[PDB]
């Protein structure tokens, strides 16, 4: 009765549907293990242990490619056109960004259909193409600048219009993308944070692509413009009492979420730039953090090795799984076009992904409605 | 439509229209026959039908208080 009373999605019938979607995605027929190279190596040593955690996992904005970089060695790039995850590895590159250092961060290109930008830890950003016919990965260029000490992070603009590479001690670089990959500006981190010797932990682009959010070690949060080439500081608020771990954005452009090393996770709205909702998560330090693409599920994963699932409008809990016997740093990641997710860690350092037959939550409620309606058209 | 219909009928207080936006005139009112039906009908909430139509009826009576159709203290004194 309570299904067919409301014919549009209300606040209450949405929170009861999304608690059945997360309940039915943990099942037996709705989970499959990714046939990786480490899933081959672990399954031999377990039938008959060296840890290499993953360092990044990124999705293409079309939602059709997935790349990720293990600790010791290689990049791995999967290609999914529609077949769930059993379609094709295209490439994996054992010496990807050189043969001396590691691959720390990754970013895809939103404009070009097939191009990554892998950043080492030395001083150099190597842009490389992933070939579609053959299984190879050829380079395109290699960027560098003067007074460049050690780059850690790289981010593309969500419009594909800039590139932001940052050190955690010295400086922050902008590279224009449209004309040529040329340095436009450079800002010293001591001008951003005036207090002490801070270490930049996380960064994010806004949904428009004109502001940058920077999270320090002392708990400060700086918001700084990028108009055409100028890079100046707009505000500076003190958010947490600890290092700001991760920063996310709402996909509807309403609010943004920050996490820290105390058990603390706020939801700040983007108009008035004040805190709006507080999640009471007094368990441990939040490690990873992500939202859905409809903007309703929020996945928190702390250092108690337990994952939670909240709402963004309210702050209520939907589901909770405990994964305690593993030795992972487990990574949640939601798909960008459909409402599936890929939770890392099955045995040692692995990746499973949790599927259904319906893509969204909206085409799940629309199928639950039409199955109930047949019964009321039966009586 | 509902407001512009009541302002042309002969049940609108033409000279007793006095407003609730002042501080001395929450007793000077208009149309005490409609104040006798509104406060009688906001007092009945015991059946299972008028527990569901209560939010729509109460929202309509607050548009009639903005405009000056009913006095404020004639509803506040005589409702349960």
């Amino acid at each position: 009765v309570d299904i067919l009373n409301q014919k549009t999605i209300t606040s209450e019938v949405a929170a009861s549907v999304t608690s059945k979607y997360l309940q039915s995605t943990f099942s037996k027929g709705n989970t499959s293990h990714i046939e990786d190279k480490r899933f081959i190596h672990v399954s031999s040593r377990s039938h008959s242990i060296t840890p290499n955690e993953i360092l990044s996992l990124k999705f293409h904005v079309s939602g059709s490619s997935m790349a990720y970089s293990r600790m010791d060695g290689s990049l791995t790039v999967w290609f999914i056109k529609d077949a769930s995850f059993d379609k094709s590895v295209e490439v994996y590159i054992p010496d990807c960004c050189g043969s001396d250092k590691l691959a720390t961060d990754l970013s895809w290109n939103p404009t070009s259909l097939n191009q990554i930008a892998v950043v080492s830890n030395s001083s150099e950003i190597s842009l490389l193409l992933i070939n579609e016919k053959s299984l190879t990965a050829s380079k395109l260029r290699t960027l560098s600048l003067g007074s460049k000490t050690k780059v850690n992070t790289c981010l593309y603009d969500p419009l594909g219009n800039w590139l932001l590479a940052a050190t955690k001690s010295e400086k922050i670089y902008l590279f224009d993308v449209k004309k040529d990959h040329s340095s436009v500006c450079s800002l010293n981190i001591s001008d951003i944070s005036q207090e002490d010797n801070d270490v930049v932990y996380s960064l994010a682009w806004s949904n428009g692509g004109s502001h940058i959010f920077i999270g320090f070690k002392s708990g400060y949060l700086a918001i700084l413009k990028a108009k055409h080439g100028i890079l100046e500081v707009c505000t500076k608020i003190k958010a947490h009492t600890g290092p700001i771990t991760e920063i996310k954005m709402d996909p509807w452009g309403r609010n943004f979420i920050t996490g820290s090393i105390d058990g603390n996770c706020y939801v700040w709205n983007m108009k008035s730039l004040c805190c709006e909702l507080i999640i009471n998560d007094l368990n441990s330090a939040v490690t990873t953090l992500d939202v859905c693409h409809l903007g309703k599920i929020l996945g928190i994963c702390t250092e108690d090795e337990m994952v939670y699932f909240y709402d963004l409008n309210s702050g209520n809990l939907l589901h909770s799984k405990s994964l305690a016997n593993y030795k992972t740093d487990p990574v949640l990641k939601f798909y960008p076009d459909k409402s599936w997710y890929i939770m890392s860690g099955k045995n040692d350092t692995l990746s499973n992904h949790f599927v259904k037959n319906e893509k969204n939550l909206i085409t799940y409620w629309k199928d639950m409605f039409d199955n109930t309606m047949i019964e009321k058209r039966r009586k | 439509f509902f407001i512009a219909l009541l302002r042309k009928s002969d049940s609108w207080p033409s000279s007793h229209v006095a407003n609730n936006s002042n501080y001395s005139s929450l007793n000077e009112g208009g149309n005490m026959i409609a104040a006798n039906i509104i406060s009688f009908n906001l007092s009945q909430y015991n059946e299972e039908v008028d527990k569901e139509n209560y939010e729509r009826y109460m929202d309509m009576c607050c548009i009639l208080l903005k405009n000056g159709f009913v006095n404020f203290y004639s509803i506040w004194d005589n409702v349960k």
Binding site: - | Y23, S24, S25, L26, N27
Partner: protein
């Protein structure tokens, strides 16, 4: 039939005290005269003591 008068709102703020701190105990510690002239008249001369 009761003539409602206009209400009177208080636009005045509360005034402070003569104790410049919270307690009378914490305030008493901050009234001791400190300086280099106070030690001067106490230790005055050792040969006068000797």
């Amino acid at each position: 039939k009761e003539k409602i008068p206009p209400p009177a709102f208080d636009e005045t703020f509360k005034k402070f005290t003569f104790i410049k701190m919270g307690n009378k105990l914490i305030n008493n510690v901050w009234k001791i005269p400190t300086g280099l002239d106070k030690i001067e008249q106490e230790v005055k001369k050792p040969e006068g003591v000797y």
